[PDB]
């Protein structure tokens, strides 16, 4: 049983995108920005508890951070993690 505190610290934000809108309307899959240490079971438990929705499968990928130059100073953004959460059919979410 995954603890509710970790499940509350797993999910960061929904990821808005054209690809995310496509997966939401066609494959019934939401795209979430999650915590970096989060696994697939922790994500599935969080969506199944905190959203009250039936999760079929979770696909994950790690996004490498870009290297930027603010002014003339070089810098690098953070690596973040992206989850494709396929809901079961009939389930709906805002």
């Amino acid at each position: 049983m995954i603890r509710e505190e970790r499940l509350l610290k797993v999910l960061r934000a929904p990821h808005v995108s054209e690809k995310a809108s496509t997966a939401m309307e066609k494959s019934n899959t939401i795209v979430l920005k999650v915590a970096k240490d989060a696994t697939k079971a922790e994500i599935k438990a969080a969506v199944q508890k905190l959203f009250e929705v039936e999760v079929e499968v979770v696909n994950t990928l790690v996004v490498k951070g870009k290297v930027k130059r603010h002014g003339q100073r070089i810098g690098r953004r953070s690596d973040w993690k992206k989850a494709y959460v396929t809901l079961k059919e009939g389930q709906n979410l805002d």
Binding site: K68, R69, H70, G71, Q72
Partner: protein, 39 residues
Amino acid sequence: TGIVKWFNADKGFGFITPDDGGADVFAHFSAIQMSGYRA
């Protein structure tokens, strides 16, 4: 383009550290050009 000082996605507005593409920032890049040029 201004890098985002911070952007209110409430209505999609807010302030932006005006990197602006900042040819001025890229003017510092040209100063770097002279520097690594000297190197």
